[PDB]
Design a protein around this ligand. Structure first.
Ligand SMILES: [Mg+2]
Ligand SMILES: [Mg+2]
Lengths: 270, 271
């Protein structure tokens, strides 16, 4: 599509936590022993309870939102407040949500997506990999490029505006989303402060990779993603500088390998 | 100075919250009705109770850290874990802390600074404006430029490495610190996940303002910070484009004003 106002938003579990204010919901949640379903980790066996009762829980959460309104969740509150601030009309909006492949997050995500659609706002939910260690953190970043950042690219190529809602989600993820999102051409970043109940447009300077580094990185790609130290020397690529910035890693002992996430980043410019 | 490993870190109040585990601290804080001192808002009259008892509370908190270790606060836990990961030695480190000009935050900041110093790590604490509304948000950003980002510029000009600790602090501020910090030449951004007790280096690509925007912004600046529509046209500046990205604002009958924070940003690229 073209000419749309696209909002990109991570999915947290404030909806799950907030819903416990409703006695009906709480009762059912207690019957299932899911009192802290908003905090369940990816490997908690109680995720399977959510999964086995997904349809029932979804419909129940939809009832909760319908009655509660935007304050039902941090996603909804920040989204609707920002539509009003920037004067985005329902018929113009596309809400792009992403959650981890975990039952509790996926439930929040499907409910939020389905409610937006009920309200006349086009919405899509994508699923990304769980980050649970330093090693799989970078695998998660790679997946965010594939599932989210590259979609931002495509939205911009199709002549849409893109607004990043930084309100929900874990800090390190929102920092990445803001950074890579801006490099991919996102227009503005925004954040709703609950403290003073107001939406702020965060400074959104249009940015790009420094030209010298982009040049060096492209040489790396063009030549091969893993390069001997000599080959890299012939190309004028300052490997030790790139290593210090954690863009490449020594693979003993001739070789330097461009990190997977940096390859994805290059995709923005190729 | 030169050749140091400089860590830039915002100051939160996890220290205050964690210290309630110390019976001596907890009973004294209860005496002052400060059980919620970690969440005290900027305009709470009780901030003055912290101020009036600042030196006493500072020593009590120092005793707590001395006994508790790095887990006393998110700052200390993330800093010390990262020194170990990156192999930074105490003699090489400079910890640049910044807190708001509020009693509770400044208390946490001075205690953390003083503790680091006791352990042989050079440290400095600077104070920034409180953000409490959308209007004063941008005044806060401007102050972060003057107090923090411009110091990163100077650390880099004096041949030091700069590492941004994104662990503590409110999300929006950490996002700004990361962006402007990288633009100013910071080397790496890092974050300790408490959940799995490990420090990750966040992706830290070397970045700059897009060239055509930087050109437009510089043309704007050298001509004047508030420009008529007519003059902006003659300079070839697409003011509506800049307005849409919230870099300039329409003022008066026919003028466009470069936002204060954008003027500070340009300071990175001009002298
Ligand atoms: Mg407002
Ligand atoms: Mg590790």
């Amino acid at each position: 599509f073209q000419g749309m106002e696209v909002h990109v938003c991570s999915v947290g579990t404030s909806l799950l936590k907030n819903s416990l204010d409703d006695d009906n919901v709480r009762k059912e949640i207690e019957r299932l022993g899911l009192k802290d379903w908003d905090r369940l980790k990816f490997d908690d066996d109680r995720q399977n309870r959510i999964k086995e009762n997904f349809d029932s829980l979804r419909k129940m959460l939809l009832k909760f939102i319908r009655s509660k309104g935007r304050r039902a969740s941090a996603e909804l509150d920040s989204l609707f407040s920002t539509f009003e601030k920037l004067k985005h009309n329902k018929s113009e909006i596309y809400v792009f949500l992403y959650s981890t492949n975990t039952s509790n997050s996926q439930l929040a995500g499907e409910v939020i997506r389905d409610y937006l659609i009920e309200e006349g706002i086009r919405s899509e939910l994508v699923t990304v990999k769980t980050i649970s260690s330093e090693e799989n953190f970078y695998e998660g970043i790679v997946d965010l490029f594939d599932k989210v950042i590259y979609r931002i690219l495509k939205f911009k190529e199709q002549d849409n505006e893109v607004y990043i809602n930084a309100t929900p989600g874990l800090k390190p993820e929102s920092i990445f989303l803001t950074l890579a999102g801006l490099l991919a051409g996102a227009d503005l970043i925004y954040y709703k402060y609950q403290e003073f109940n107001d939406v702020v447009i965060l400074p959104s300077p249009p940015i790009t990779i420094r030209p010298k580094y982009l040049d060096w990185l492209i040489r790396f790609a063009i030549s091969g993603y893993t390069l001997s130290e000599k080959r890299a020397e012939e190309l004028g690529i300052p490997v030790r500088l790139l290593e210090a910035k954690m863009l490449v890693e020594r693979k003993g002992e001739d070789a330097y390998r461009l990190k997977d996430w940096v390859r994805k980043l290059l995709g923005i410019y190729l």
